[PDB]
């Protein structure tokens, strides 16, 4: 198999024509927000096949130098050129059009006009990706995480509204105490936004956004990113200030901040992340949350009606007299339907009821002018079929034999005798 | 089609390969017996070689 040249080949080919197609995407205009998502969301799983095959086309070299120098060798060499044009001359009887290796590729990564999604991604849903609520991008439900926010805080002095303004909090005074139960229900509601954050932009590189925070996280927040000018320097896992930079970096290798209270860098590790992911998430989806933000408030202030609606985005005597409007059809005229029974009748002997029925293979006649089953045809041309007679020669022989009472033979018998003898 | 396909496309993994324009290991098939009318541009099929070659040659 030729992985040096037809594989690689085949492999920068399939890439060009990904590149093509969300080039022919990134030129076409867009007009709502569904169908942006839905080409975003094609062009990220395009993207994924892009990776792959230029992930497998780096894995097929390491033998291409192992037979560089006989490949190179192009004067010594010609016969294995024979020994396989020698074996293309099998199975010539391959009577075929081929003019898929190419087309096929194109057709593939491309879309039909009823619906905007190319054959790879044909099954692609936003529906099993987005709720109605969301909207596509242009909102965020945070309904659900309302209630559980009730049952966590164990009493109802608070709104959807007052809900918002906790969650528009950065890095200020926390809701409750952050060794509390808290921490549950923000891992939760995290999860969400960070999926929604990916979900809502799926043309940016999850793994660069991810990798990013994670450094930012390692680098800056646990060591030190707070700072005051008690004020000093803040720690999110241990809760507390600190005099200097020498007294909070000798704090950092102590039990109580490494493994020695509840509220460690071994213990609280993943809520203490989760509580930075959350905030620059937040911060990503700040358009968002204003929206969101606007939409409660907009939604709160209607009326019963004006919610349901957002939730919810002649001739007559002489066609009677002439016969029209009648039922009647023509299964001999190539089964055509006639609005009258004189059209019918007419329609039966016409032009194309005897053209059909000369390429049925059936002679109309006189009698058979009415015919409309092909099966009472068949039998109206068997009994039409020249009478009954042909017989003008078929006794006539004059046997010798005795010429008096044994002469019994047919025309073909004394046609054949006269013949033979 | 699948036969002049791979016909095209195997003298066109041979062709790519030379060491100059007109010392390659299809020349001396073509004087040797080996009837190719493609490899002549009086034949349509020679400008789908030529990109098959360049093809070749860019996967150099």
Redesign the interface.
Known sequence: M?T???Q??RY??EKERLMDVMAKEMLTKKSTLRDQINSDHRTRAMQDRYMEVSGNLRDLYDDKDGLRKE??N??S??NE??E??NR?KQI?E?H????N?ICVPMSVEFEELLKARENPSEEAQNLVEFTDEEGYGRYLDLHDCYLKYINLKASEKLDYITYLSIFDQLFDIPKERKNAEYKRYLEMLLEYLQDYTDRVKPLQDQNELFGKIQAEFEKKWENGTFPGWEERAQRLFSTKGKSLESLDTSLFAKNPKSKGTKRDTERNKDIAFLEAQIYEYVEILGEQRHLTHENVQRKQARTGEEREEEEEEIPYWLYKLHGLNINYNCEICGNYTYRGPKAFQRHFAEWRHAHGMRCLGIPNTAHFANVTQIEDAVSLWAKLKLQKASERWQPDTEEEYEDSSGNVVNKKTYEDLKRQG | SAFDLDVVKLTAQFVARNGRQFLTQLMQKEQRNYQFDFLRPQHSLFNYFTKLVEQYTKIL
Not at chain 1, 96 to 99: A, S, T
Request: net charge negative.
């Open positions: 030729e040096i040249l037809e690689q080949r920068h080919e490949e190179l192009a004067i060499g010609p050129f024979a396989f044009y293309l010539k391959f075929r059009k081929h003019p290796e």
